[PDB]
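Supplementary Methods S3. Input chains for the assembly prediction are listed below.
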Amino acid sequence: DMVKEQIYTIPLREVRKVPAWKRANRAVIEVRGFLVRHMKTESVQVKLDKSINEHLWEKGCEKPPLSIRVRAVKFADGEVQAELAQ
Amino acid sequence: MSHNMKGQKKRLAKAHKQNTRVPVWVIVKTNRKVVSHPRRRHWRRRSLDVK
Amino acid sequence: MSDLSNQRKLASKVLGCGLDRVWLNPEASEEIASAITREDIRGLIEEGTIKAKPVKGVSRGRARALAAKRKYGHCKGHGSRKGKKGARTPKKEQWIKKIRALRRRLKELRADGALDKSVYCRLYRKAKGGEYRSVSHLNSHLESEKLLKKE
Amino acid sequence: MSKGTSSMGKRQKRTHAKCRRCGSVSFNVHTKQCTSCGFGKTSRMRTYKWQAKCKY
Amino acid sequence: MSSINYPFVTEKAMMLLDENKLQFIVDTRSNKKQILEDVEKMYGFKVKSVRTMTTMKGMKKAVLAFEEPEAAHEIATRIGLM
RNA sequence: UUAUGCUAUCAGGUGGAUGGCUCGGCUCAAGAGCUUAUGAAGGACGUGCCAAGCUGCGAUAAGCCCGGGGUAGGUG
RNA sequence: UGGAGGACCGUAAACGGUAUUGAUCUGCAAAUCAUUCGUGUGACCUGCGUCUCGUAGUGAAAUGCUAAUCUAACCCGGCA
RNA sequence: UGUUCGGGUCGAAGCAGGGCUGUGAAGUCCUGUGGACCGUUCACAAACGAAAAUCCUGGUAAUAGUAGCAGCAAAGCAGG
RNA sequence: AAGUCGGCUUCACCCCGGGACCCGUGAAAAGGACAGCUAAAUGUCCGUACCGAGAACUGACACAGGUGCCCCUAGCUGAAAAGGCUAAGGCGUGUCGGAGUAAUUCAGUUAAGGGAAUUCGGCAAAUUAGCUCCGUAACUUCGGGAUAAGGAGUGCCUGCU
RNA sequence: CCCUAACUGGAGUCCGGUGAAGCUUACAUUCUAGUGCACAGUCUAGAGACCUCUAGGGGGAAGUGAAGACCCCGUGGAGC
RNA sequence: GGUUUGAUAGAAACGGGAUGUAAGCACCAAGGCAACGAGGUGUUCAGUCCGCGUUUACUAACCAUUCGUUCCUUUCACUU
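Predicted structure tokens for the full assembly:
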């Protein structure tokens, strides 16, 4: 079952280097890579919650937040579930 | 919705039913010697000289 | 699911709405995919698997508030005016309303007997010539020069 | 407007229709004549010696 | 010269049997009057109306609406459709 | 095992020359030589169980009838 | 008051094609695109139909246009 | 082509490579491949010999995994 | 499931009438009306799908051109069918990714002080800009020049004429 | 413009997929001078030069595009 | 350059900065009979933010691979 249940603050300042209209789906990739590296899993096993995607796309494709706070759970199968956190 | 007469529509129908592949049984009968066809075409190309 | 595109197009046709107004249940995907005919689509619609999403209109409350203020006479100043004076109030319309008011006033006066024909003719031509700004001006002139046959 | 591809977009009609007599799409819709076989001009078939070379 | 070639048996054409209509491939030379008279001679049923269209196969299709109830079913059974 | 390369040969791919074959073409000679309103030639459309082209045929539609030759296969 | 004018401004309605001597220049395009511009109730623009053509037509006239061809089009023939 | 004399399924023509001869045009032979035609004497003919024509037709390189797949127009992301 | 009512406005559509202009004085013919009512029968033939265009046409192309256009187009702002933001409807349809993603380049934003010294030339870019009010020269064919020039105001709220 | 700087989006740069065309007798890592049809990477004598790859602007290849539209000639044309 | 024998990067907090006093609440507000009311004051140098630093192993610098052997072999300095 659940292996770890950790909360993270993912910084998205490197997302700003990308051309502005690409920033939202650059930040999605940054979130997925952050979770891959910190949970020690594969890219295809990191599942991002609708809350996370909503927050990343709240202000349009050009103005994602400079950071996002998430709660990530790692299971024995290797799958990771990440949700938005207050 | 251009308006054709009976003969024009008949000739378009003939062109449409000509635009078909050679039958597989015809290919078998000719031993893969008649596989091609001069009246094959596509609708979005050089138009028919029929209408 | 395979393509539900055929089912979505048929459902939009059956509902009389746009293609994106049609909402297909993302859980009843195989139930939708089993639906082939108009009757099947109607059954899905009646059982709620397929529905037309509500039209998202354009709200008008913040325009109603502005319209109320404009009726009161605010939010309509020189810094808000952008068309010419004449495009905002046509001069023929102004003249038509003014002259019709004056003519109706003269007609009512001659009907009720305050104005005999001799002075009515001159007053009517004066009004047609623009001597009077409005019915109030006409009445003020009448009361000033005692044209009404008071009794 | 250019005499080339721009003006070539106005080509949504015809000057010649299919000929009853010869089947060629050569029947002038204005002169009511086939420029291939001569139908609508002559009871004979339209032929000239200059359609081939002088045979020598 | 019979105008009727043969009864036309597709899904939509078979849908006519439940409304007593019958669809035929007919000679494109012939008209509605000839089709009606020839069908009435062929099967002994009074024809109520004829609808006709031309297809992109170069064929002419005629839907015949009969006056006697069950005439379409009886003609289909006589032909061998049903 | 010195890569990237160069030269020659060999094996293979591509390609379709060469050779051989050919029911086609060309030229010459000898014959034969008109046809259509009793609707010609030509064209359009249709016509095959599966048939799209050509060819033949014309709603009797790759065909129908009669006489002769041919005779056991035929369905271009 | 009235509402005239080959009147005025103005639409990426329509028509035209000034300047950038910009983009493009084996192009999106055998001449187009962006911005900037001229006309925009009239000698206006435009559909469809119809007519006028090769020593001829058409031309508010540049030898412009007459099917990407014009100081005499194109096809075939004279022609090897 | 006429004519003389031949070769070939125990492997002709052609093709790739090689040996020998001849100043040479070229001839002959060997190996492999190929599967049915080919030479030779004396003569006679010609649609008879190609490295070139911005030659023609066909095939195929370098360029080169290069340019392009960028103004259209904010073009996609999450989950299933 | 309700399904009942009122009011305002109304183009760019329908009816009707008036006026002005001539300088093109602005079609013809079929058909219809003026005497028809009732009842049966008949009304054949051709087209009809779909695109009608930044992918169904045309330009050799799934071509940024061109091709009849509509006597087609909702809310706010606004003179407006301009421009902006939104409905309905149609779409994400025509290569991706990417670590500063260097230099360079196409198209843009901004730029101290100077302000055409640049250049053949103010080319390009910048300035001004709507509406209201005041005011408006030389010259003139008396029409104009004219939005000349040059000045002032403009938002929101409360209450009003 | 003095006199340029920073920034935005699209290209470019790097990666995956797709995938052309144009110059080409050959060879080719050149530079200087001379010579030569008097404007040479190839001749002559010197001087240099280890090879391969990537990016970059275009000095040269009298670069490519094209049987010079200027001039003359042709007992060649056309129009006027 | 660092890689647990660690402050390399990030999180958290704080320092140092940017902006200009957040939302809600209360009082006032020209006036309006009232409903309301642009805005002012206090809460509040607040609120929001930091592609800088410090402290701090809290997560990630883990797990490994590869060359330094010509490869197969016993043409061996070796081991089943």
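The two ends of chain B are 14 Å apart (CA to CA). Chain B is about 40% helix and 0% strand.
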